[PDB]
Design an enzyme around this catalytic site. Structure first.
Site, PDB file in Angstrom:
ATOM      1  N   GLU A 353      -1.336 -10.774   7.364  1.00 16.64           N
ATOM      2  CA  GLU A 353      -2.733 -10.234   7.500  1.00 16.64           C
ATOM      3  C   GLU A 353      -3.723 -11.750   7.249  1.00 16.64           C
ATOM      4  O   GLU A 353      -2.930 -12.699   6.911  1.00 16.64           O
ATOM      5  CB  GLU A 353      -2.810  -9.364   6.421  1.00 16.64           C
ATOM      6  N   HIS A 439       2.788  -4.793  -2.293  1.00 16.79           N
ATOM      7  CA  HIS A 439       4.007  -4.082  -2.259  1.00 16.79           C
ATOM      8  C   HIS A 439       5.295  -3.365  -2.118  1.00 16.79           C
ATOM      9  O   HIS A 439       5.649  -3.986  -1.627  1.00 16.79           O
ATOM     10  CB  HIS A 439       4.046  -4.195  -0.460  1.00 16.79           C
ATOM     11  N   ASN A 477       3.129  -4.418   6.414  1.00 13.22           N
ATOM     12  CA  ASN A 477       2.137  -3.293   5.421  1.00 13.22           C
ATOM     13  C   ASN A 477       2.697  -2.141   5.145  1.00 13.22           C
ATOM     14  O   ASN A 477       3.148  -1.519   6.593  1.00 13.22           O
ATOM     15  CB  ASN A 477       0.774  -2.724   5.942  1.00 13.22           C
TER      16      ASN A 477
HETATM   17  C1  LIG Z   1      -4.604  -4.023  -2.867  1.00 14.80           C
HETATM   18  C2  LIG Z   1      -3.589  -3.622  -2.389  1.00 14.80           C
HETATM   19  C3  LIG Z   1      -3.520  -3.651  -1.242  1.00 14.80           C
HETATM   20  C4  LIG Z   1      -3.162  -2.939  -0.810  1.00 14.80           C
HETATM   21  N1  LIG Z   1      -2.810  -2.985   1.281  1.00 14.80           N
HETATM   22  C5  LIG Z   1      -2.178  -2.432   1.816  1.00 14.80           C
HETATM   23  C6  LIG Z   1      -1.694  -2.083   3.529  1.00 14.80           C
HETATM   24  O1  LIG Z   1      -3.440  -2.372   3.402  1.00 14.80           O
HETATM   25  N2  LIG Z   1      -1.838  -1.323   4.118  1.00 14.80           N
HETATM   26  C7  LIG Z   1      -0.596  -0.616   3.647  1.00 14.80           C
HETATM   27  O2  LIG Z   1       0.355  -0.290   4.555  1.00 14.80           O
HETATM   28  N3  LIG Z   1      -0.304  -0.720   2.510  1.00 14.80           N
HETATM   29  C8  LIG Z   1      -0.926  -1.415   1.726  1.00 14.80           C
HETATM   30  N4  LIG Z   1      -0.723  -1.415  -0.326  1.00 14.80           N
HETATM   31  C9  LIG Z   1       0.568  -0.788  -0.173  1.00 14.80           C
HETATM   32  C10 LIG Z   1       0.259   0.995  -0.651  1.00 14.80           C
HETATM   33  O3  LIG Z   1      -0.635   1.055  -0.768  1.00 14.80           O
HETATM   34  C11 LIG Z   1       1.796   1.191  -1.256  1.00 14.80           C
HETATM   35  O4  LIG Z   1       2.831   0.441  -0.682  1.00 14.80           O
HETATM   36  C12 LIG Z   1       1.074   2.812  -1.625  1.00 14.80           C
HETATM   37  O5  LIG Z   1       0.360   3.235  -1.770  1.00 14.80           O
HETATM   38  C13 LIG Z   1       2.573   2.954  -1.446  1.00 14.80           C
HETATM   39  O6  LIG Z   1       2.643   3.992  -1.892  1.00 14.80           O
HETATM   40  P1  LIG Z   1       3.306   5.307  -3.171  1.00 14.80           P
HETATM   41  O7  LIG Z   1       3.524   7.120  -2.674  1.00 14.80           O
HETATM   42  O8  LIG Z   1       5.207   4.858  -3.098  1.00 14.80           O
HETATM   43  O9  LIG Z   1       2.934   5.528  -4.544  1.00 14.80           O
HETATM   44  P2  LIG Z   1       1.414   5.259  -5.147  1.00 14.80           P
HETATM   45  O10 LIG Z   1       0.475   5.415  -3.436  1.00 14.80           O
HETATM   46  O11 LIG Z   1       1.392   3.739  -5.730  1.00 14.80           O
HETATM   47  O12 LIG Z   1       1.132   6.134  -5.517  1.00 14.80           O
HETATM   48  C14 LIG Z   1       2.031   6.829  -7.019  1.00 14.80           C
HETATM   49  C15 LIG Z   1       0.984   7.427  -7.652  1.00 14.80           C
HETATM   50  O13 LIG Z   1       1.670   8.314  -8.647  1.00 14.80           O
HETATM   51  C16 LIG Z   1       0.796   8.266 -10.029  1.00 14.80           C
HETATM   52  N5  LIG Z   1       1.778   8.221 -11.653  1.00 14.80           N
HETATM   53  C17 LIG Z   1       2.482   7.213 -11.685  1.00 14.80           C
HETATM   54  N6  LIG Z   1       3.365   7.358 -12.286  1.00 14.80           N
HETATM   55  C18 LIG Z   1       2.954   8.482 -13.034  1.00 14.80           C
HETATM   56  C19 LIG Z   1       3.365   9.664 -13.929  1.00 14.80           C
HETATM   57  N7  LIG Z   1       4.184   9.216 -14.742  1.00 14.80           N
HETATM   58  N8  LIG Z   1       2.250  10.434 -14.018  1.00 14.80           N
HETATM   59  C20 LIG Z   1       1.810  11.084 -13.554  1.00 14.80           C
HETATM   60  N9  LIG Z   1       0.974   9.696 -12.354  1.00 14.80           N
HETATM   61  C21 LIG Z   1       1.687   9.020 -12.280  1.00 14.80           C
HETATM   62  C22 LIG Z   1      -0.457   6.763 -10.309  1.00 14.80           C
HETATM   63  O14 LIG Z   1      -1.124   6.617 -10.707  1.00 14.80           O
HETATM   64  C23 LIG Z   1      -0.497   7.040  -8.080  1.00 14.80           C
HETATM   65  O15 LIG Z   1      -1.847   7.636  -7.534  1.00 14.80           O
HETATM   66  C24 LIG Z   1      -1.778  -2.342  -0.513  1.00 14.80           C
HETATM   67  C25 LIG Z   1      -1.696  -1.970  -2.006  1.00 14.80           C
HETATM   68  C26 LIG Z   1      -2.679  -2.646  -2.541  1.00 14.80           C
HETATM   69  C27 LIG Z   1      -2.350  -1.962  -4.217  1.00 14.80           C
END
Ligand SMILES: Cc1cc2nc3c(=O)[nH]c(=O)nc-3n(C[C@H](O)[C@H](O)[C@H](O)COP(=O)(O)OP(=O)(O)OC[C@H]3O[C@@H](n4cnc5c(N)ncnc54)[C@H](O)[C@@H]3O)c2cc1C
Length: 498
Positions: A353, A439, A477
């Protein structure tokens, strides 16, 4: 109480799962530990910007932090804060800090919006048990459309001051033989043009992204979750954290769930049960729930792969000092638009990036977030003493990632007669940040802890949906991959199991 399906979390895996469940007529409750981000705060905005962080920036911390790379310019705006249910959580493990979103929409609230499909040959390498034709023919297109992926206008990009930083790194990379690519996004680029014209409220062009965007960014609350709620079959309970999971004596699953206020005070502990249980708590959250359940005896049939196979998507941050004649601009859109694609599936692969920086005055720094191919993996190991799943990853495990990133950026430095910055990450001379992750991938890997659709081994009607499924690396990403895999998985689970 009882609800037919429960989904834990509200990120990408969770949101896809709940939409399709609701469309299938299955009454579904989503439990989210963070807030629904829809209340104007003390500045009249939902989210704080990067130059005015406050308690909304941080999940239960007592001081704000500068965005990584920007401490030299943004520590001046840091302040003490009350611990609060803010939007960004830096989760500190012994030798790794993982950043995750907390709220309705998960990481979609805080991420850079970059929506990128993995290279098919790499997908085929990392997940050989998955039919790649259905992924590229059906599920990636479906994810692209539902996520509201869009594309920057090339003329606008070329002309605007807000992307000078990107053009500078493209020119420098070009002198080294290295190409760039435009990166699709869920941030509305038409909106962004209007921001630059002074026509609509700024967000990307007002130093907002990592603590949320008040405008422009189509996070999951606007896309999948809005649609899930629209089915009439889905509800969301916020500030509800699942702590334990057990299989009930009469079938299904029972959860202990803590309800807190935004100050973290415990209001209630509830028992919620269901027939179908979907984990979408993220790489960290889903893995922790299952390692806890195995090792405390509430899901004793879980296998030894639960906890294993974690990697940080090869994430490394680095920066170059430009020549004085190549300023990057005081005005940098907070949404990246360009990357350097040097990814060929070999060990030297880098997808990096070209990252904006928020300082707001000229610093001549180019910042990069490199994605690399590093085979090292960590394991989450339950600590019964503190009731936490600890990640056993050591900084030396990122040496292959550093080495790959450094070889690439050394080429650029050689071609241009530039040097790294060494002062962006702390006082110690350090050009490569090697102990953070945006990530997180793995912990409950597809086909190892689960079947090839995320059905947890040892159990019926128990599913994992999220980044915990991915084997440590996708080369880009990750959210588009998480979303498309979740589309594949829930379609098959509903057809065969529900
Ligand atoms: C600063 C930053 C920049 C990024 N930039 C990019 C980008 O531009 N493009 C890209 O592809 N990816 C990017 N990412 C990565 C991307 O956001 C993640 O890969 C993605 O959000 C993961 O999705 P997920 O469904 O695994 O979990 P998450 O999106 O992390 O969601 C998990 C959810 O579960 C909730 N939770 C957790 N444990 C519990 C529990 N025990 N009980 C209840 N709720 C709970 C959390 O609060 C959260 O809302 C970035 C991430 C960050 C932090």
């Amino acid at each position: 109480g009882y609800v037919p399906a429960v989904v834990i979390g509200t990120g990408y895996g969770a949101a896809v799962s709940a939409l399709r469940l609701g469309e299938a007529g299955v009454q579904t409750l989503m439990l989210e530990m963070g807030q629904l981000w829809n209340q104007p705060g003390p500045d009249g905005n939902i989210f704080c910007g990067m130059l005015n962080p406050d308690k909304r920036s941080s999940w239960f911390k007592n001081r704000t932090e500068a965005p990584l790379g920007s401490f030299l310019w943004l520590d001046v705006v840091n302040r003490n804060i009350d611990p609060y249910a803010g939007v960004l959580d830096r989760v500190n493990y012994d030798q790794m800090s993982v950043y995750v979103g907390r709220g309705v929409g998960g990481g979609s609230l805080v991420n850079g919006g970059m929506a990128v499909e993995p290279k098919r040959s790499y997908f085929e390498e990392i997940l050989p048990r998955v039919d790649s034709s259905e992924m590229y023919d059906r599920y990636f297109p479906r994810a692209n459309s539902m996520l509201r992926v869009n594309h920057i206008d090339t003329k606008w990009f070329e002309d605007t001051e807000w992307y000078k930083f990107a053009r500078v790194s493209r020119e420098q990379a070009g002198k080294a033989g290295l190409g760039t690519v435009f990166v699709p996004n869920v941030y509305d680029f038409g909106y962004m043009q209007r921001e630059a014209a002074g026509e609509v409220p700024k967000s990307a062009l007002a130093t907002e992204v990592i603590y949320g965007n008040n405008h422009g960014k189509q996070s999951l609350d606007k896309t999948y979750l809005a649609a899930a709620l629209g089915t009439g079959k889905v509800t969301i309970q916020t500030l509800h954290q699942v702590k334990t999971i057990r299989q009930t004596k009469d079938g299904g699953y029972a959860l202990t769930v803590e309800q807190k206020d935004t100050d973290g005070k415990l209001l209630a502990t509830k028992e919620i049960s269901c027939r179908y249980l979907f984990l979408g708590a993220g790489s960290l959250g889903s893995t922790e729930l299952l390692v806890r359940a195995r090792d405390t005896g509430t899901l004793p049939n879980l296998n030894s792969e639960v906890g294993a196979g974690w990697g940080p998507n090869g994430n490394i941050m680095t920066a170059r000092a430009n020549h004085m004649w190549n300023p990057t601009g005081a005005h940098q859109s907070s949404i990246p638009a360009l990357g350097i694609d040097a990814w060929d599936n070999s060990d030297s692969s880098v997808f990096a990036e070209i990252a904006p920086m928020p300082a707001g005055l000229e610093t001549w720094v180019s910042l990069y977030l490199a994605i690399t191919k590093n085979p090292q993996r960590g394991t989450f190991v339950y600590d019964a003493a503190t009731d936490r799943a600890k990640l056993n990853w050591t900084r030396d495990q990122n040496a292959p990632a550093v080495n790959a990133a450094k070889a690439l950026f050394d080429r650029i430095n050689k071609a241009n007669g530039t040097i790294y910055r060494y002062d962006l990450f702390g006082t110690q001379l350090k050009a490569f940040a090697d102990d953070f992750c945006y990530h997180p991938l793995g912990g409950c890997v597809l086909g190892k802890a689960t079947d090839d659709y995320g059905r947890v081994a040892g159990y019926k009607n128990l599913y994992v949906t999220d980044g915990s499924l991915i084997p440590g690396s996708v080369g880009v990403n990750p959210f588009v991959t998480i979303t498309a895999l979740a589309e594949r998985n829930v379609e098959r689970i509903i057809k065969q199991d529900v």
